[PDB]
């Protein structure tokens, strides 16, 4: 056997093993043989063997998707274009009211007289619907420390104006609508963005700059245009471009053509942001390690109105970060976290989290279950000093 992990190890192992056996036994005693035809658990062929399927197949006919192209005369008469089938001039069934149908919206029509019965949501590139956040992160504004003025500005530009419009509307200030976050790698940009996404109360979209380069000409611009149309359907949304330097490259066309399609997509984003077509309720963020490369047209107010500098944290912020990350630990009681803050010279958040984890490591390798000071000193050594030359 082994050294002995815990007194109950064997007892829990036994209860798990017989749990597995009883689960297998019920599996055999209930059937549930995997079916290659995608068919539900027999206890879930429910309303399915009968009584809803047989009641849904009778009244619910098959409508066919069609894309309205024109709505001529006040009298209902609709030209729809069924995909790869035909193109017709049809009328409205009674269920839909005339106001519901507009030009350009997908509609459903029946298979006999092709009259309109239901609208439908527009078609969005599968690669442009996933950038919605769906499940929001849990990081919050207590997890970001040593950046207090920066977070204040970000919160006053992306967050406060949506929650309390009347403050700004009364005095008559249209709040800035863009932020450029720039600072050394690993200083707190993406984390503050995560926090903003968690706290905010409106649609959030994550776009990577490297996600807008495409093989076929004139696709990236379409992607940007669709993204902004989608974001404009919502009531209010935030878009957070990462590594925007990916496609905001400076314009240097000369001689043989080089990186020109990226330039067209960049111009399309520029025109979407601030341009003839009004930008509705949208707020934009960008993060870059290298803000200089961004072109003169993007970095201009009206598109990126604010510029927040993230600098390496000061000593107070250093200890604060140490303490935030050393929270869910099984750690000793008294650690002079000021000592640890001093002992690491200018170092970023990533340094500090690495310090915490390396201290946990040096605790484990010593077969200890509570982290002490010596663990943290060893951690700081192994992190700062040893990995200096990189």
């Amino acid at each position: 056997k082994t050294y002995g992990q815990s007194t109950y190890s064997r007892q829990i192992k036994q209860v798990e093993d017989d749990i597995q056996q009883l689960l297998k036994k019920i599996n055999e005693l209930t059937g549930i043989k995997e079916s290659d035809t995608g068919l539900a658990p027999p206890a879930l062929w429910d309303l399915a063997a009968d009584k809803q399927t047989l009641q849904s197949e009778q009244p619910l006919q098959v409508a066919r998707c069609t894309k309205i192209i024109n709505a001529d005369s006040e009298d209902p008469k609709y030209i729809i274009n069924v995909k790869q089938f035909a193109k017709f001039v049809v009328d409205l069934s009674d269920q839909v009211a005339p106001t519901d149908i507009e030009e350009g919206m997908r509609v459903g029509v029946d298979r006999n007289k092709y009259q309109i019965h239901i609208p439908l949501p527009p078609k969005i590139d599968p690669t442009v619907t996933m950038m919605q956040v769906e499940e929001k992160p849990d990081v919050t504004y207590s997890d970001v420390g040593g950046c207090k003025e920066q977070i204040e500005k970000l919160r006053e530009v992306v967050e406060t104006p949506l929650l309390h419009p009347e403050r700004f509307v009364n005095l008559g200030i249209e709040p800035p609508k863009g932020v450029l976050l720039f600072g050394p790698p690993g200083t707190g940009k993406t984390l503050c963005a995560r926090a903003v996404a968690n706290r905010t109360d409106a649609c959030f979209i994550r776009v990577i700059g490297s996600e807008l380069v495409q093989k076929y000409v004139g696709e990236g611009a379409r992607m940007v245009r669709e993204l902004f149309e989608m974001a404009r359907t919502k009531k209010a949304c935030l878009i957070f471009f990462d590594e925007i330097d990916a496609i905001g490259g400076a314009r240097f066309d000369d001689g043989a053509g080089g990186d020109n399609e990226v330039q067209r997509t960049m111009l399309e984003l520029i025109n979407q942001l601030d341009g003839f077509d009004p930008r509705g309720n949208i707020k934009v963020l960008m993060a870059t390690n290298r803000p200089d490369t961004l072109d003169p047209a993007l970095m201009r107010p009206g598109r990126l109105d604010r510029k927040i500098e993230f600098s390496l944290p000061d000593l107070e912020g250093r200890t604060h970060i140490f303490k935030i990350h050393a929270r869910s630990m099984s750690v000793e009681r008294d650690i002079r976290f000021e000592l640890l803050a001093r002992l690491c010279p200018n170092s970023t958040g990533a340094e500090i989290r690495s310090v915490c984890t390396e201290a946990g490591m040096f605790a484990i390798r010593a077969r200890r279950k509570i982290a002490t000071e010596k663990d943290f000193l060893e951690a700081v050594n192994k992190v700062i000093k040893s990995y200096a030359k990189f």
Binding site: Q5, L22, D36, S56, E57, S210, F240, S354
Partner: protein, 393 residues
């Protein structure tokens, strides 16, 4: 099988024992009652004939369409093969866990209502990147590292073996390990070993294999590579010869280097970005590391960084006896005489010496390999050094 989570301390304890004993006892009551019912009545006939009703509802000429958007409410837009787009009703017997956009759905012929789904191929890229067992050898064939292998084991293997250790204290494992050192020193081999020894799906890629000749293909490749790694449970990725893709990132450059930088940004986001990386680890190798980008090898992206020195005096003996292991040698083999020289030999150099000696032994028909052959082979292999002798010294 969709069992309850104990969510006691999760570490061996009395509460984990009582929440565990309770589920066991309920399963016991259920099993007893079920066995009683089965003895009292088979129900085989009743469970049957439900298949018959289902197959009655789904007519014989079932049609394979292609789902394209689920309205979230037991409805769908299913596209027939030609290209038409219908708006059908999802019935009650389709296992909805298997319904996602792009799935080959099985529709009714007259009514196209969704009545099933089908499996798909498993090789978008899974086959081409997964390496299976390493043909070279297991941890046995590697010697002299000891400390490095220990680091890797703790970084990538130990968090899979016994999560309790890390979990007990509230610290997550390191994120990624970058293997750096002089060429021919045991990086790729150690990755191969920790691959063939662990229990996850290990994927390997060459950096020059991410340099694509159509725009926006490198970023797609990296995005996919990190896309079929969460589909597959715990997973490991090893991007070898990364130097060819991650470089200092000098801005005064023209050509396809911009695409290189753009794929580097995609990777830099995948490793640590907006979303949570799930359960995956990232190993990397680079013979030349001083030239990587600070944001790629920064702490939260790659916590562990491993140096790989050359064999010094004795690891040379170990490697030599490892590669000479399978060959009949004459009883005059002065191996130390070959090792004692401080010729800065590398591991791959040792393999080259072994193979060349074996090959000339084959050339001369001789049933055994002689020391003179090994020394001649050593001279021949070292002959591939060159350079300007007085210069620089």
């Amino acid at each position: 099988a969709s069992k309850l989570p104990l969510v006691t301390p999760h570490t061996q304890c009395r509460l984990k024992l009582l929440k565990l004993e309770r589920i066991k006892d309920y399963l016991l009551m259920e099993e007893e009652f079920i066995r009683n019912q089965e003895q009292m009545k088979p129900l085989e006939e009743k469970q049957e004939e439900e298949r018959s009703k289902v197959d009655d509802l789904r007519g014989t000429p079932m049609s394979v369409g292609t789902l394209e958007e689920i309205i979230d409410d037991n409805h769908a837009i299913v596209s027939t093969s030609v290209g038409s787009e219908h708006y059908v009703s999802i019935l009650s017997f389709v296992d909805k866990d298997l319904l996602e956009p792009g799935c080959s759905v099985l529709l009714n012929h007259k009514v196209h209502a969704v009545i099933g789904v089908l499996m798909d191929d498993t090789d978008p890229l899974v086959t081409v990147m997964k390496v299976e067992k390493a043909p070279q050898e297991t941890y046995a064939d590697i010697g002299g590292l000891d400390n490095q292998i220990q680091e890797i084991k703790e970084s990538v293997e130990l968090p899979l073996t016994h999560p309790e250790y890390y979990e007990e204290m509230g610290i997550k494992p390191p994120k990624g390990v970058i293997l750096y050192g002089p060429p021919g020193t045991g990086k790729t081999l150690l990755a191969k070993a920790v691959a063939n020894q662990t229990s996850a799906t290990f994927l390997r890629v060459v950096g020059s294999e991410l340099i694509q000749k159509y725009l926006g293909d490198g970023p797609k490749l990296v995005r996919e590579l990190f896309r079929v790694a969460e589909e597959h449970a715990p997973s490991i990725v090893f991007i070898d010869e990364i130097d060819a893709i991650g470089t200092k990132r000098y801005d005064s450059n023209s050509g396809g280097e911009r695409e290189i930088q753009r794929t580097m940004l995609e990777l830099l986001n995948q490793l640590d970005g907006f979303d949570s990386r799930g359960d995956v680890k990232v190993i990397m190798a680079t013979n030349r590391i001083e030239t990587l980008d600070p944001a790629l090898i920064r702490p939260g992206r790659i916590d562990r960084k491993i140096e790989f020195p050359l064999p010094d005096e004795k690891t040379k003996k170990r490697i030599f006896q490892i590669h000479t292991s399978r060959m009949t040698l004459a009883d005059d083999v002065t191996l130390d005489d070959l090792i004692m020289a401080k010729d800065d030999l590398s591991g791959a150099d040792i393999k080259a010496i072994c193979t060349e000696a074996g090959l000339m032994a084959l050339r001369e028909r001789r049933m055994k390999v002689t020391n003179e052959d090994f020394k001649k082979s050593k001279e021949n292999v070292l002959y591939k050094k060159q350079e300007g002798t007085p210069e620089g010294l």
